[PDB]
Write a structure and sequence with these properties.
Blueprint (H helix, E strand, L loop, with lengths): L1 H11 L10 E2 L3 E2 L9 H16 L14 E4 L2 E4 L5 H19 L11 H4 L2
Antiparallel strand pairs: 1-2, 3-4
Helix pairs in contact: 1-3, 2-3
Length: about 120
């Protein structure tokens, strides 16, 4: 669920408040269309698409599905006790958190005008 995803981000990117990723570019946070503004935005686009794929699983709701994962000593892991839905969304979240940690963060792309620049 979103609470867990937030914690994954805090796990992989300790040097930044997770809020910095809540409204970035065309894909991070609200909005899910247009051309990704940079590498970080591409991470969010992939995450968006991943959730769309997971929701094709019967009764699978990415934003609310509670999965089993662990974050210790710099390692993020999705546990083996997850059913197909939980396993899928945990992986979507894990890959995005890892993607975030290796992508540059440009302050100029934070809180941009989605209606005007993401068409």
């Amino acid at each position: 669920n979103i609470y867990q995803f937030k914690n994954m981000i805090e796990c992989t990117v300790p040097a930044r408040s997770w809020w910095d990723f809540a409204d970035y570019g065309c894909y991070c946070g609200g909005g899910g269309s247009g051309t990704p503004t940079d590498d970080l935005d591409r991470c969010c686009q992939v995450h968006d698409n991943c959730y769309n794929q997971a929701q094709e699983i019967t009764g699978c709701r990415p934003k609310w599905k509670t999965y089993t994962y662990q974050c210790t000593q710099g390692t993020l892991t999705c546990k083996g006790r997850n059913n197909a839905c939980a396993a899928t969304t945990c992986d979507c979240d894990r890959l995005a958190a890892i993607c975030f940690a290796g992508a540059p963060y440009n302050d100029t792309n934070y809180n941009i005008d989605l209606k005007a620049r993401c068409q």
